[PDB]
Symmetry: D2
Subunit: 205 residues, 4 copies
């Protein structure tokens, strides 16, 4: 008996492809340091949980909440970064405006891409601390629901798909923007992969 381990996905572009909006220095450590660290951390804990399940670790030799809470931290750390890389593209291919159905829903619910952009930016800058800003597609209501996550595992909405995701941990921008998080959020719009977001939305109609 065992659990299947997670694998680090390949970066969809060169570490310097997002310049000048996100320097290669950040991407390098962000992918090779942080993201790889969550794949390793998750697998390491799955291994430890396997021991609890098999009985190799007896009662009193582990503290279940430490393992379980550590898994949601690392597993989300991995899954969220995987979505992040795919949600961005080299400028010229990335940025601009959305089209297809995504553009349509945005117009019906926010009035226009420009208004949506303002509301999302405002919401992302209000996040108290480290976390993420995401745009969900609620398969139940059909709403494009904005949400801010605290850390990697707080504030999620169950089961629904993530269409847009912005990493707001300080490591995602500090080396280049320092404490100017807002400038980072502003620069981010220039590398958003609207094509990828459109394709993901299509899967859920």
């Amino acid at each position: 008996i065992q659990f299947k381990k997670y694998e680090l996905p390949p970066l969809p572009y060169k570490i310097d492809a997002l310049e000048p909006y996100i320097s290669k220095d950040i991407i390098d450590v962000h992918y090779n340091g942080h993201h790889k660290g969550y794949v390793n951390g998750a697998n390491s804990l799955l291994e430890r949980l396997e021991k609890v399940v098999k009985g190799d670790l007896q009662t009193g030799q582990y503290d279940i909440q430490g393992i379980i809470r550590g898994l949601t931290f690392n597993i989300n750390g991995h899954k969220l970064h995987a979505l992040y890389w795919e949600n961005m593209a080299p400028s010229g291919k990335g940025g601009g405006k959305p089209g297809g159905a995504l553009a349509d829903l945005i117009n019906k619910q926010y009035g226009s891409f420009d208004r949506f952009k303002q509301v999302f930016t405002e919401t992302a800058n209000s996040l108290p601390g480290t976390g993420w800003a995401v745009l969900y597609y609620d398969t139940e209501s059909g709403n494009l629901q904005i949400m801010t996550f605290e850390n990697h595992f707080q504030n999620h909405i169950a089961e629904i798909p993530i269409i847009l995701i912005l990493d707001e941990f300080e490591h995602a921008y500090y080396l280049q923007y320092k404490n100017k998080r807002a400038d980072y959020v502003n620069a981010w719009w220039n590398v958003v992969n609207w094509d990828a977001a459109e394709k993901k939305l299509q899967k859920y109609l």
Copy 2:
């Protein structure tokens, strides 16, 4: 422009169908009071968010984090309870052991249903405070991942489906079990809807 509102789903059985494991007194207020309250609370906040989007509420007339955090609380409050009702069934129809593919995966990852049951129960009783105990089916790894949520919105794992869900807020058992949460968890196994769980799993293979 507007957001679509949420609707209270009908209870799949009589309020006394889960007796003697969960009294009708609890089910009545749990469904008609708590769950209905989250549908209303979510819709009320969507309405307020619409005003922010349209501009009927000017800057300084709202505090975005209060609205956004309130939405994850109420929306999850609604979605999680909807899953909860469907995850249980009258004794005789509910409880017992799982079959099909779900039984298979449990045997491969936990060794047996009996061991799985022990680990899930142990994990559910370790939750510090109010929350939920769930069994996920990670579409990425194929793992049946156990997890405890704190409140309705903390500790989730992004996008993956929930196969088993146990409400661990005090209102789910207090009237009948008082502070004996563990007795409630034990009684719960007798009403689990394994058929429904099996069907949901099939959707993701």
Copy 3:
């Protein structure tokens, strides 16, 4: 080497002294079940932590975050309930209006006890889930700062003293008020121990 253990403080009155606002049925289990449970849970974890410190538990035989997070949960569970009991008194001795310096500060910062009462009640009813509503006395600014805690350990403000504290976990009122939390908050004002609150404030000037 060892850590000193916590002790369950005696209830300052009979379990039925708060009736008809809080029934003896609630007080009994709240004190003898819940509060006692946190003293025991804290002491149990301190002993486990002692083993980690002494080396009786080797690396790989414990998960530090499970122990540390479990301690903040149980220790606050204990400390907060101890403050709660002392912050109430039988109707006649309790309830009414505050006097002395506490009354003074309330008038200067909120305009009147009436207005303060409205703002505190509004804030307490807004808490998303289980937690506490407290009134701090910030020794740095001199402000009587209102705050809502989530669970027993989230949202605290470092080092400053708690003057007023209201338990908002469902177990504090469910048996008598069911899901009508707001009715519980309103009834609570009739048993507040303003004299005790006044004495605590005096200690910090």
Copy 4:
């Protein structure tokens, strides 16, 4: 009616006094950017809360949880950084080993400063995400309680004094140590102000 505002305390040394353990580049933005930002953010929200109290903001023109949760974030952001600066000192004056009563309690509870150092370091490196590592002096039990905070406001223990505090947000070390948080924690011991910690402990006996 009004609330008193917070003031940015002066840094107890030159921005380059902690080198080579913490570069002046970090201290500069950490104090002039981040800490100043929390004093401003707190004061800004107190003024908004004043408007709610006075009635200048009517119901429907604010979302109380956004204000209250924003205050615990900013107020702790301020208070915790104030403690942080005072808890360090230039190499020579800082670092080394503790003496007086603090040294005594450490020996009685951890066996030795060396062992204490290992346990604190291990605990600090286990923090899942951004936060703080602190050493409390519980006035109730007399225990020197270790604790990790998540963000600036989660996991605190009510009312007790903080003796040691280590900032573990990425901004406290990223520019110099990048993702090597552990190297930062090790370097930190060389600038700890044991004299200041000893004096604070004395106040509580």
